[PDB]
Design a protein around this ligand. Sequence first.
Ligand SMILES: CCCCCCCCC/C=C/C(=O)SCCNC(=O)CCNC(=O)[C@H](O)C(C)(C)COP(=O)(O)OP(=O)(O)OC[C@H]1O[C@@H](n2cnc3c(N)ncnc32)[C@H](O)[C@@H]1OP(=O)(O)O
Length: 266
Amino acid sequence: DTHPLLGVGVTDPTNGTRVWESELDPDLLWLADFVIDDLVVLPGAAYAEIALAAATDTFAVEQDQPWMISELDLRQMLHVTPGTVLVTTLTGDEQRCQVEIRTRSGWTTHATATVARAEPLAPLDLEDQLDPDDLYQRLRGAGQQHGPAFQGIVGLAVTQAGVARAQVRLPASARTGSREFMLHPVMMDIALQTLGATRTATDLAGSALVVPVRFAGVHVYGDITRGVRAVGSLAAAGDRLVGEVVLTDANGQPLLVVDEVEMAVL
Ligand SMILES: CCCCCCCCC/C=C/C(=O)SCCNC(=O)CCNC(=O)[C@H](O)C(C)(C)COP(=O)(O)OP(=O)(O)OC[C@H]1O[C@@H](n2cnc3c(N)ncnc32)[C@H](O)[C@@H]1OP(=O)(O)O
């Protein structure tokens, strides 16, 4: 019943802080399939799941998706090596809490997140088809090496306005070990990959490594492994890039909405 990324938790009686430790290894589940410059790196989406799982393990709430991520900061890349120990802390209350994700070196901080009670979903184009193989080739040429578990874009198009629209699926090798996820990281990453097909992205490659450094307004309305369509838009913000992605199910219901994904260009 133990979450494979968050691990097992205790509350420190001397300060009220909840603390978890998990043992990570490159052979754990699908982690080996997320590679940057030949090194196994923990994907940004995994930190989002860890923060949501931490809140869910701390507070009793009788809702399937009680939380949103107000802000998540990705401060330092994590190289997943044998014997890695991920240390998560949570402070706060059932309305708003602060999560910090570290590795045992002392400790190094990899991500911080503010988690809050979910805001409900409110009710208030000509295309050019693209080849998904070309997207993954562009990403690999930039040093972003998604293995089979992450190769979930199976159809792709871009609108005249430069918005990317993808048909998505969760590869079988990403499905084991997922029962405990609030937000399936591989699925969230697949949704983000759509940003690589926007006009802004292809103009930049027409390369440099583009990595997420901040998420704001991550909304989860259901089980995102039911997602079949992702729509992503990307704009320049000075030397950075800012995107927005929506993942919907086969009946058009939004499952995941990321209001801002801020990326650095290396
Ligand atoms: C093309 C389309 C493709 C689209 C295709 C997309 C498909 C999905 C691809 C997914 C890829 C990944 O998931 S990659 C894995 C997830 N991403 C990551 O791990 C990125 C982790 N972050 C980083 O490595 C770093 O931020 C890095 C980018 C190298 C910049 O590092 P530096 O510290 O050296 O530079 P910084 O100044 O710190 O970075 C920005 C700010 O970070 C913070 N920082 C420093 N100390 C801080 C502090 N004490 N408290 C808060 N923040 C602090 C401050 O906010 C900084 O300003 P100051 O306060 O003054 O310091």
